């Protein structure tokens, strides 16, 4: 059975969850939520329909945890297996820049 295919990108100024196609985004319908599955009052996130990306800032859409930040993502009423959590580190290392 298909696994959630969003690719986590922890960037210097945002978090992205990137997809291979707009169809994957529409199928999984990822949304930023809190640890219980509810919307975060402060959080504005963006869906880029051309590049197939969910993106959002650290401060308003993630929670501080040891060593970094946690974001909670709902996919899909609640369904089994509908909650995901991801971690981004506080410290990002940069060696060579290749933005993509």
mmCIF file of N, CA, C and O in Angstrom:
data_model
loop_
_atom_site.group_PDB
_atom_site.id
_atom_site.type_symbol
_atom_site.label_atom_id
_atom_site.label_comp_id
_atom_site.label_asym_id
_atom_site.label_seq_id
_atom_site.Cartn_x
_atom_site.Cartn_y
_atom_site.Cartn_z
ATOM 1 N N UNK A 1 0.843 -1.202 0.000
ATOM 2 C CA UNK A 1 0.000 0.000 0.000
ATOM 3 C C UNK A 1 0.868 1.238 0.000
ATOM 4 O O UNK A 1 1.862 1.285 0.781
ATOM 5 N N UNK A 2 0.522 2.233 -0.843
ATOM 6 C CA UNK A 2 1.371 3.434 -0.958
ATOM 7 C C UNK A 2 1.623 4.094 0.393
ATOM 8 O O UNK A 2 0.733 4.272 1.197
ATOM 9 N N UNK A 3 2.882 4.409 0.692
ATOM 10 C CA UNK A 3 3.353 5.176 1.828
ATOM 11 C C UNK A 3 3.286 6.673 1.556
ATOM 12 O O UNK A 3 3.327 7.113 0.414
ATOM 13 N N UNK A 4 3.225 7.457 2.616
ATOM 14 C CA UNK A 4 3.198 8.905 2.423
ATOM 15 C C UNK A 4 4.483 9.342 1.733
ATOM 16 O O UNK A 4 5.582 9.087 2.265
ATOM 17 N N UNK A 5 4.409 9.969 0.560
ATOM 18 C CA UNK A 5 5.624 10.220 -0.215
ATOM 19 C C UNK A 5 6.231 11.603 -0.101
ATOM 20 O O UNK A 5 7.162 11.922 -0.808
ATOM 21 N N UNK A 6 5.715 12.416 0.788
ATOM 22 C CA UNK A 6 6.261 13.735 0.948
ATOM 23 C C UNK A 6 7.701 13.665 1.430
ATOM 24 O O UNK A 6 8.034 12.962 2.384
ATOM 25 N N UNK A 7 8.560 14.441 0.774
ATOM 26 C CA UNK A 7 9.971 14.518 1.095
ATOM 27 C C UNK A 7 10.212 15.719 1.983
ATOM 28 O O UNK A 7 9.946 16.854 1.598
ATOM 29 N N UNK A 8 10.739 15.447 3.165
ATOM 30 C CA UNK A 8 10.995 16.496 4.145
ATOM 31 C C UNK A 8 12.259 17.276 3.775
ATOM 32 O O UNK A 8 13.327 16.653 3.602
ATOM 33 N N UNK A 9 12.146 18.594 3.708
ATOM 34 C CA UNK A 9 13.275 19.482 3.506
ATOM 35 C C UNK A 9 13.293 20.526 4.601
ATOM 36 O O UNK A 9 12.445 21.423 4.638
ATOM 37 N N UNK A 10 14.275 20.437 5.471
ATOM 38 C CA UNK A 10 14.442 21.402 6.560
ATOM 39 C C UNK A 10 15.388 22.470 6.037
ATOM 40 O O UNK A 10 16.576 22.218 5.877
ATOM 41 N N UNK A 11 14.875 23.637 5.721
ATOM 42 C CA UNK A 11 15.678 24.709 5.139
ATOM 43 C C UNK A 11 15.946 25.781 6.193
ATOM 44 O O UNK A 11 15.442 25.764 7.289
ATOM 45 N N UNK A 12 16.734 26.790 5.813
ATOM 46 C CA UNK A 12 17.153 27.817 6.742
ATOM 47 C C UNK A 12 16.025 28.761 7.118
ATOM 48 O O UNK A 12 16.121 29.416 8.156
ATOM 49 N N UNK A 13 15.029 28.903 6.264
ATOM 50 C CA UNK A 13 13.998 29.884 6.484
ATOM 51 C C UNK A 13 12.595 29.306 6.413
ATOM 52 O O UNK A 13 11.643 30.074 6.459
ATOM 53 N N UNK A 14 12.434 27.999 6.285
ATOM 54 C CA UNK A 14 11.148 27.330 6.193
ATOM 55 C C UNK A 14 11.401 25.834 6.204
ATOM 56 O O UNK A 14 12.518 25.365 5.991
ATOM 57 N N UNK A 15 10.290 25.113 6.394
ATOM 58 C CA UNK A 15 10.223 23.686 6.189
ATOM 59 C C UNK A 15 9.402 23.458 4.933
ATOM 60 O O UNK A 15 8.356 24.116 4.747
ATOM 61 N N UNK A 16 9.827 22.524 4.078
ATOM 62 C CA UNK A 16 9.043 22.090 2.930
ATOM 63 C C UNK A 16 8.776 20.596 3.026
ATOM 64 O O UNK A 16 9.637 19.822 3.495
ATOM 65 N N UNK A 17 7.626 20.197 2.529
ATOM 66 C CA UNK A 17 7.320 18.805 2.278
ATOM 67 C C UNK A 17 6.969 18.736 0.791
ATOM 68 O O UNK A 17 5.971 19.329 0.358
ATOM 69 N N UNK A 18 7.836 18.100 0.012
ATOM 70 C CA UNK A 18 7.788 18.176 -1.446
ATOM 71 C C UNK A 18 7.238 16.877 -2.021
ATOM 72 O O UNK A 18 7.518 15.787 -1.507
ATOM 73 N N UNK A 19 6.553 17.000 -3.152
ATOM 74 C CA UNK A 19 5.903 15.873 -3.814
ATOM 75 C C UNK A 19 6.376 15.725 -5.251
ATOM 76 O O UNK A 19 6.877 16.644 -5.886
ATOM 77 N N UNK A 20 6.140 14.530 -5.776
ATOM 78 C CA UNK A 20 6.480 14.208 -7.171
ATOM 79 C C UNK A 20 5.471 14.725 -8.168
ATOM 80 O O UNK A 20 5.800 14.820 -9.369
ATOM 81 N N UNK A 21 4.250 14.966 -7.746
ATOM 82 C CA UNK A 21 3.208 15.385 -8.673
ATOM 83 C C UNK A 21 2.132 16.093 -7.874
ATOM 84 O O UNK A 21 2.017 15.961 -6.639
ATOM 85 N N UNK A 22 1.307 16.847 -8.594
ATOM 86 C CA UNK A 22 0.174 17.433 -7.899
ATOM 87 C C UNK A 22 -0.798 16.348 -7.454
ATOM 88 O O UNK A 22 -1.471 16.511 -6.448
ATOM 89 N N UNK A 23 -0.844 15.212 -8.152
ATOM 90 C CA UNK A 23 -1.762 14.144 -7.765
ATOM 91 C C UNK A 23 -1.410 13.552 -6.405
ATOM 92 O O UNK A 23 -2.308 13.212 -5.626
ATOM 93 N N UNK A 24 -0.117 13.403 -6.095
ATOM 94 C CA UNK A 24 0.241 12.942 -4.757
ATOM 95 C C UNK A 24 -0.239 13.922 -3.700
ATOM 96 O O UNK A 24 -0.729 13.513 -2.641
ATOM 97 N N UNK A 25 -0.081 15.223 -3.942
ATOM 98 C CA UNK A 25 -0.527 16.186 -2.940
ATOM 99 C C UNK A 25 -2.032 16.109 -2.757
ATOM 100 O O UNK A 25 -2.541 16.169 -1.632
ATOM 101 N N UNK A 26 -2.765 16.018 -3.864
ATOM 102 C CA UNK A 26 -4.217 15.956 -3.747
ATOM 103 C C UNK A 26 -4.663 14.674 -3.050
ATOM 104 O O UNK A 26 -5.620 14.682 -2.268
ATOM 105 N N UNK A 27 -3.971 13.563 -3.303
ATOM 106 C CA UNK A 27 -4.352 12.301 -2.681
ATOM 107 C C UNK A 27 -4.127 12.346 -1.179
ATOM 108 O O UNK A 27 -4.992 11.940 -0.396
ATOM 109 N N UNK A 28 -2.975 12.853 -0.759
ATOM 110 C CA UNK A 28 -2.604 12.823 0.662
ATOM 111 C C UNK A 28 -3.113 14.022 1.440
ATOM 112 O O UNK A 28 -3.278 13.909 2.656
ATOM 113 N N UNK A 29 -3.385 15.136 0.782
ATOM 114 C CA UNK A 29 -3.976 16.313 1.417
ATOM 115 C C UNK A 29 -3.271 16.655 2.741
ATOM 116 O O UNK A 29 -3.923 16.755 3.781
ATOM 117 N N UNK A 30 -1.959 16.853 2.732
ATOM 118 C CA UNK A 30 -1.263 17.124 3.991
ATOM 119 C C UNK A 30 -1.648 18.486 4.543
ATOM 120 O O UNK A 30 -1.772 19.467 3.805
ATOM 121 N N UNK A 31 -1.807 18.541 5.862
ATOM 122 C CA UNK A 31 -2.139 19.779 6.520
ATOM 123 C C UNK A 31 -1.328 19.869 7.806
ATOM 124 O O UNK A 31 -1.039 18.856 8.441
ATOM 125 N N UNK A 32 -0.906 21.066 8.160
ATOM 126 C CA UNK A 32 -0.158 21.285 9.398
ATOM 127 C C UNK A 32 -1.123 21.317 10.551
ATOM 128 O O UNK A 32 -2.121 22.061 10.521
ATOM 129 N N UNK A 33 -0.822 20.537 11.590
ATOM 130 C CA UNK A 33 -1.677 20.412 12.769
ATOM 131 C C UNK A 33 -0.776 20.390 14.010
ATOM 132 O O UNK A 33 0.461 20.351 13.916
ATOM 133 N N UNK A 34 -1.416 20.381 15.189
ATOM 134 C CA UNK A 34 -0.715 20.177 16.436
ATOM 135 C C UNK A 34 -0.614 18.695 16.748
ATOM 136 O O UNK A 34 -0.977 17.823 15.961
ATOM 137 N N UNK A 35 -0.046 18.379 17.937
ATOM 138 C CA UNK A 35 0.207 17.011 18.321
ATOM 139 C C UNK A 35 -1.052 16.160 18.512
ATOM 140 O O UNK A 35 -0.929 14.938 18.647
ATOM 141 N N UNK A 36 -2.205 16.805 18.574
ATOM 142 C CA UNK A 36 -3.499 16.147 18.726
ATOM 143 C C UNK A 36 -4.312 16.153 17.442
ATOM 144 O O UNK A 36 -5.448 15.711 17.456
ATOM 145 N N UNK A 37 -3.793 16.740 16.362
ATOM 146 C CA UNK A 37 -4.508 16.765 15.102
ATOM 147 C C UNK A 37 -5.338 17.998 14.804
ATOM 148 O O UNK A 37 -6.037 18.010 13.787
ATOM 149 N N UNK A 38 -5.294 19.006 15.643
ATOM 150 C CA UNK A 38 -6.048 20.244 15.478
ATOM 151 C C UNK A 38 -5.226 21.325 14.775
ATOM 152 O O UNK A 38 -4.020 21.323 14.844
ATOM 153 N N UNK A 39 -5.876 22.251 14.074
ATOM 154 C CA UNK A 39 -5.165 23.393 13.504
ATOM 155 C C UNK A 39 -4.448 24.208 14.586
ATOM 156 O O UNK A 39 -4.941 24.364 15.710
ATOM 157 N N UNK A 40 -3.290 24.769 14.214
ATOM 158 C CA UNK A 40 -2.526 25.654 15.071
ATOM 159 C C UNK A 40 -2.984 27.066 14.759
ATOM 160 O O UNK A 40 -2.889 27.509 13.599
ATOM 161 N N UNK A 41 -3.421 27.811 15.789
ATOM 162 C CA UNK A 41 -4.063 29.097 15.557
ATOM 163 C C UNK A 41 -3.166 30.053 14.795
ATOM 164 O O UNK A 41 -3.668 30.825 13.953
ATOM 165 N N UNK A 42 -1.877 30.077 15.117
ATOM 166 C CA UNK A 42 -0.933 31.013 14.526
ATOM 167 C C UNK A 42 -0.449 30.614 13.150
ATOM 168 O O UNK A 42 0.333 31.373 12.575
ATOM 169 N N UNK A 43 -0.756 29.421 12.678
ATOM 170 C CA UNK A 43 -0.042 28.864 11.532
ATOM 171 C C UNK A 43 -0.709 29.208 10.207
ATOM 172 O O UNK A 43 -1.865 28.820 9.979
ATOM 173 N N UNK A 44 0.024 29.874 9.327
ATOM 174 C CA UNK A 44 -0.307 29.973 7.924
ATOM 175 C C UNK A 44 0.706 29.125 7.173
ATOM 176 O O UNK A 44 1.925 29.328 7.314
ATOM 177 N N UNK A 45 0.194 28.211 6.321
ATOM 178 C CA UNK A 45 1.046 27.417 5.457
ATOM 179 C C UNK A 45 0.659 27.644 4.005
ATOM 180 O O UNK A 45 -0.408 28.206 3.713
ATOM 181 N N UNK A 46 1.512 27.253 3.113
ATOM 182 C CA UNK A 46 1.311 27.456 1.684
ATOM 183 C C UNK A 46 1.344 26.132 0.952
ATOM 184 O O UNK A 46 2.182 25.261 1.256
ATOM 185 N N UNK A 47 0.495 26.002 -0.047
ATOM 186 C CA UNK A 47 0.534 24.920 -1.018
ATOM 187 C C UNK A 47 0.924 25.507 -2.361
ATOM 188 O O UNK A 47 0.212 26.376 -2.865
ATOM 189 N N UNK A 48 1.989 25.014 -2.957
ATOM 190 C CA UNK A 48 2.426 25.424 -4.270
ATOM 191 C C UNK A 48 1.978 24.331 -5.220
ATOM 192 O O UNK A 48 2.506 23.223 -5.226
ATOM 193 N N UNK A 49 0.956 24.665 -6.015
ATOM 194 C CA UNK A 49 0.342 23.747 -6.948
ATOM 195 C C UNK A 49 1.192 23.465 -8.190
ATOM 196 O O UNK A 49 0.942 22.471 -8.927
ATOM 197 N N UNK A 50 2.144 24.349 -8.474
ATOM 198 C CA UNK A 50 3.037 24.205 -9.625
ATOM 199 C C UNK A 50 4.241 23.344 -9.315
ATOM 200 O O UNK A 50 4.633 22.509 -10.141
ATOM 201 N N UNK A 51 4.847 23.581 -8.144
ATOM 202 C CA UNK A 51 6.031 22.857 -7.727
ATOM 203 C C UNK A 51 5.714 21.664 -6.872
ATOM 204 O O UNK A 51 6.574 20.808 -6.663
ATOM 205 N N UNK A 52 4.479 21.570 -6.382
ATOM 206 C CA UNK A 52 3.980 20.444 -5.599
ATOM 207 C C UNK A 52 4.645 20.422 -4.210
ATOM 208 O O UNK A 52 5.281 19.445 -3.813
ATOM 209 N N UNK A 53 4.471 21.505 -3.486
ATOM 210 C CA UNK A 53 5.124 21.697 -2.198
ATOM 211 C C UNK A 53 4.146 22.204 -1.174
ATOM 212 O O UNK A 53 3.355 23.109 -1.444
ATOM 213 N N UNK A 54 4.245 21.680 0.037
ATOM 214 C CA UNK A 54 3.672 22.241 1.246
ATOM 215 C C UNK A 54 4.827 22.933 1.975
ATOM 216 O O UNK A 54 5.851 22.303 2.205
ATOM 217 N N UNK A 55 4.690 24.200 2.327
ATOM 218 C CA UNK A 55 5.767 24.910 2.995
ATOM 219 C C UNK A 55 5.245 25.804 4.083
ATOM 220 O O UNK A 55 4.121 26.318 4.015
ATOM 221 N N UNK A 56 6.071 26.029 5.095
ATOM 222 C CA UNK A 56 5.612 26.767 6.255
ATOM 223 C C UNK A 56 6.809 27.210 7.079
ATOM 224 O O UNK A 56 7.878 26.598 7.049
ATOM 225 N N UNK A 57 6.613 28.264 7.889
ATOM 226 C CA UNK A 57 7.681 28.754 8.750
ATOM 227 C C UNK A 57 7.821 27.958 10.018
ATOM 228 O O UNK A 57 6.888 27.328 10.467
ATOM 229 N N UNK A 58 9.003 28.024 10.603
ATOM 230 C CA UNK A 58 9.267 27.373 11.860
ATOM 231 C C UNK A 58 8.456 27.958 13.022
ATOM 232 O O UNK A 58 7.917 27.226 13.831
ATOM 233 N N UNK A 59 8.458 29.278 13.137
ATOM 234 C CA UNK A 59 7.983 29.919 14.355
ATOM 235 C C UNK A 59 6.510 29.691 14.625
ATOM 236 O O UNK A 59 6.102 29.635 15.792
ATOM 237 N N UNK A 60 5.695 29.666 13.595
ATOM 238 C CA UNK A 60 4.276 29.667 13.749
ATOM 239 C C UNK A 60 3.604 28.335 13.504
ATOM 240 O O UNK A 60 2.455 28.190 13.820
ATOM 241 N N UNK A 61 4.306 27.357 12.941
ATOM 242 C CA UNK A 61 3.737 26.093 12.507
ATOM 243 C C UNK A 61 4.424 24.843 13.030
ATOM 244 O O UNK A 61 3.975 23.738 12.708
ATOM 245 N N UNK A 62 5.480 25.005 13.807
ATOM 246 C CA UNK A 62 6.209 23.901 14.407
ATOM 247 C C UNK A 62 6.345 24.187 15.897
ATOM 248 O O UNK A 62 6.166 25.335 16.314
ATOM 249 N N UNK A 63 6.683 23.185 16.660
ATOM 250 C CA UNK A 63 6.981 23.351 18.084
ATOM 251 C C UNK A 63 8.448 23.074 18.351
ATOM 252 O O UNK A 63 9.072 22.186 17.775
ATOM 253 N N UNK A 64 9.001 23.842 19.281
ATOM 254 C CA UNK A 64 10.360 23.613 19.728
ATOM 255 C C UNK A 64 10.439 22.304 20.507
ATOM 256 O O UNK A 64 9.596 22.083 21.405
ATOM 257 N N UNK A 65 11.446 21.484 20.204
ATOM 258 C CA UNK A 65 11.719 20.247 20.894
ATOM 259 C C UNK A 65 13.237 20.171 21.150
ATOM 260 O O UNK A 65 13.992 21.020 20.687
ATOM 261 N N UNK A 66 13.687 19.142 21.848
ATOM 262 C CA UNK A 66 15.127 19.062 22.097
ATOM 263 C C UNK A 66 15.870 18.968 20.770
ATOM 264 O O UNK A 66 15.574 18.125 19.932
ATOM 265 N N UNK A 67 16.843 19.874 20.580
ATOM 266 C CA UNK A 67 17.663 19.848 19.405
ATOM 267 C C UNK A 67 17.049 20.413 18.148
ATOM 268 O O UNK A 67 17.723 20.393 17.118
ATOM 269 N N UNK A 68 15.809 20.909 18.165
ATOM 270 C CA UNK A 68 15.207 21.350 16.916
ATOM 271 C C UNK A 68 13.735 21.629 17.054
ATOM 272 O O UNK A 68 13.269 22.222 18.039
ATOM 273 N N UNK A 69 13.022 21.220 16.004
ATOM 274 C CA UNK A 69 11.626 21.584 15.808
ATOM 275 C C UNK A 69 10.879 20.337 15.352
ATOM 276 O O UNK A 69 11.388 19.556 14.552
ATOM 277 N N UNK A 70 9.632 20.211 15.822
ATOM 278 C CA UNK A 70 8.748 19.149 15.375
ATOM 279 C C UNK A 70 7.569 19.752 14.648
ATOM 280 O O UNK A 70 6.973 20.746 15.069
ATOM 281 N N UNK A 71 7.222 19.173 13.499
ATOM 282 C CA UNK A 71 5.953 19.522 12.852
ATOM 283 C C UNK A 71 5.088 18.272 12.816
ATOM 284 O O UNK A 71 5.563 17.152 12.620
ATOM 285 N N UNK A 72 3.813 18.492 13.000
ATOM 286 C CA UNK A 72 2.791 17.482 12.904
ATOM 287 C C UNK A 72 1.960 17.727 11.646
ATOM 288 O O UNK A 72 1.591 18.861 11.347
ATOM 289 N N UNK A 73 1.707 16.638 10.934
ATOM 290 C CA UNK A 73 1.041 16.666 9.641
ATOM 291 C C UNK A 73 -0.082 15.646 9.675
ATOM 292 O O UNK A 73 0.136 14.473 9.952
ATOM 293 N N UNK A 74 -1.291 16.090 9.337
ATOM 294 C CA UNK A 74 -2.410 15.185 9.117
ATOM 295 C C UNK A 74 -2.556 14.959 7.608
ATOM 296 O O UNK A 74 -2.310 15.841 6.801
ATOM 297 N N UNK A 75 -2.952 13.753 7.243
ATOM 298 C CA UNK A 75 -3.262 13.413 5.873
ATOM 299 C C UNK A 75 -4.701 12.934 5.789
ATOM 300 O O UNK A 75 -5.307 12.493 6.758
ATOM 301 N N UNK A 76 -5.235 12.946 4.575
ATOM 302 C CA UNK A 76 -6.627 12.542 4.413
ATOM 303 C C UNK A 76 -7.527 13.742 4.175
ATOM 304 O O UNK A 76 -8.756 13.591 3.987
ATOM 305 N N UNK A 77 -12.932 14.291 9.126
ATOM 306 C CA UNK A 77 -13.024 12.981 9.780
ATOM 307 C C UNK A 77 -11.633 12.374 9.987
ATOM 308 O O UNK A 77 -10.779 12.562 9.150
ATOM 309 N N UNK A 78 -11.440 11.656 11.095
ATOM 310 C CA UNK A 78 -10.150 11.025 11.359
ATOM 311 C C UNK A 78 -10.124 9.604 10.812
ATOM 312 O O UNK A 78 -11.134 8.885 10.848
ATOM 313 N N UNK A 79 -8.934 9.181 10.371
ATOM 314 C CA UNK A 79 -8.731 7.823 9.885
ATOM 315 C C UNK A 79 -7.507 7.241 10.561
ATOM 316 O O UNK A 79 -6.566 7.960 10.907
ATOM 317 N N UNK A 80 -7.469 5.927 10.697
ATOM 318 C CA UNK A 80 -6.274 5.275 11.185
ATOM 319 C C UNK A 80 -5.088 5.692 10.335
ATOM 320 O O UNK A 80 -5.179 5.818 9.081
ATOM 321 N N UNK A 81 -3.947 5.872 10.989
ATOM 322 C CA UNK A 81 -2.699 6.173 10.311
ATOM 323 C C UNK A 81 -2.659 7.594 9.725
ATOM 324 O O UNK A 81 -1.712 7.891 9.022
ATOM 325 N N UNK A 82 -3.543 8.523 10.142
ATOM 326 C CA UNK A 82 -3.614 9.825 9.531
ATOM 327 C C UNK A 82 -2.649 10.884 10.103
ATOM 328 O O UNK A 82 -2.634 11.987 9.577
ATOM 329 N N UNK A 83 -1.869 10.553 11.112
ATOM 330 C CA UNK A 83 -1.009 11.532 11.767
ATOM 331 C C UNK A 83 0.448 11.148 11.581
ATOM 332 O O UNK A 83 0.862 10.027 11.884
ATOM 333 N N UNK A 84 1.230 12.136 11.131
ATOM 334 C CA UNK A 84 2.661 12.036 10.938
ATOM 335 C C UNK A 84 3.349 13.123 11.760
ATOM 336 O O UNK A 84 2.788 14.180 12.003
ATOM 337 N N UNK A 85 4.586 12.849 12.141
ATOM 338 C CA UNK A 85 5.411 13.868 12.791
ATOM 339 C C UNK A 85 6.812 13.790 12.217
ATOM 340 O O UNK A 85 7.305 12.717 11.933
ATOM 341 N N UNK A 86 7.401 14.978 12.075
ATOM 342 C CA UNK A 86 8.724 15.116 11.497
ATOM 343 C C UNK A 86 9.562 16.046 12.367
ATOM 344 O O UNK A 86 9.053 16.924 13.038
ATOM 345 N N UNK A 87 10.875 15.863 12.264
ATOM 346 C CA UNK A 87 11.838 16.643 13.037
ATOM 347 C C UNK A 87 12.798 17.371 12.081
ATOM 348 O O UNK A 87 13.305 16.787 11.124
ATOM 349 N N UNK A 88 13.071 18.620 12.436
ATOM 350 C CA UNK A 88 14.112 19.400 11.769
ATOM 351 C C UNK A 88 15.092 19.899 12.834
ATOM 352 O O UNK A 88 14.677 20.407 13.865
ATOM 353 N N UNK A 89 16.379 19.821 12.568
ATOM 354 C CA UNK A 89 17.370 20.241 13.556
ATOM 355 C C UNK A 89 17.449 21.754 13.681
ATOM 356 O O UNK A 89 17.216 22.514 12.742
ATOM 357 N N UNK A 90 17.872 22.204 14.852
ATOM 358 C CA UNK A 90 18.102 23.641 15.080
ATOM 359 C C UNK A 90 19.295 24.156 14.302
ATOM 360 O O UNK A 90 19.334 25.304 13.907
ATOM 361 N N UNK A 91 20.289 23.328 14.126
ATOM 362 C CA UNK A 91 21.523 23.746 13.488
ATOM 363 C C UNK A 91 21.567 23.120 12.120
ATOM 364 O O UNK A 91 21.371 21.903 11.946
ATOM 365 N N UNK A 92 21.651 23.984 11.082
ATOM 366 C CA UNK A 92 21.816 23.597 9.689
ATOM 367 C C UNK A 92 23.242 23.890 9.249
ATOM 368 O O UNK A 92 23.751 24.992 9.467
ATOM 369 N N UNK A 93 23.898 22.944 8.629
ATOM 370 C CA UNK A 93 25.228 23.120 8.068
ATOM 371 C C UNK A 93 25.178 23.411 6.592
ATOM 372 O O UNK A 93 24.392 22.809 5.880
ATOM 373 N N UNK A 94 26.018 24.313 6.131
ATOM 374 C CA UNK A 94 26.087 24.693 4.736
ATOM 375 C C UNK A 94 27.531 24.503 4.284
ATOM 376 O O UNK A 94 28.479 25.066 4.854
ATOM 377 N N UNK A 95 27.681 23.716 3.242
ATOM 378 C CA UNK A 95 28.990 23.636 2.619
ATOM 379 C C UNK A 95 28.972 24.217 1.215
ATOM 380 O O UNK A 95 29.377 25.362 0.994
ATOM 381 N N UNK A 96 28.430 23.506 0.275
ATOM 382 C CA UNK A 96 28.255 24.088 -1.053
ATOM 383 C C UNK A 96 26.781 24.351 -1.262
ATOM 384 O O UNK A 96 25.948 23.532 -0.871
ATOM 385 N N UNK A 97 26.464 25.503 -1.849
ATOM 386 C CA UNK A 97 25.078 25.862 -2.130
ATOM 387 C C UNK A 97 24.651 25.241 -3.441
ATOM 388 O O UNK A 97 25.316 25.376 -4.463
ATOM 389 N N UNK A 98 23.663 24.390 -3.400
ATOM 390 C CA UNK A 98 22.949 24.062 -4.635
ATOM 391 C C UNK A 98 21.454 24.018 -4.349
ATOM 392 O O UNK A 98 20.870 22.913 -4.230
ATOM 393 N N UNK A 99 20.792 25.110 -4.672
ATOM 394 C CA UNK A 99 19.391 25.225 -4.321
ATOM 395 C C UNK A 99 18.619 24.542 -5.425
ATOM 396 O O UNK A 99 19.007 24.593 -6.603
ATOM 397 N N UNK A 100 17.572 23.841 -5.026
ATOM 398 C CA UNK A 100 16.760 23.117 -5.969
ATOM 399 C C UNK A 100 15.453 22.789 -5.305
ATOM 400 O O UNK A 100 14.648 22.111 -5.954
#
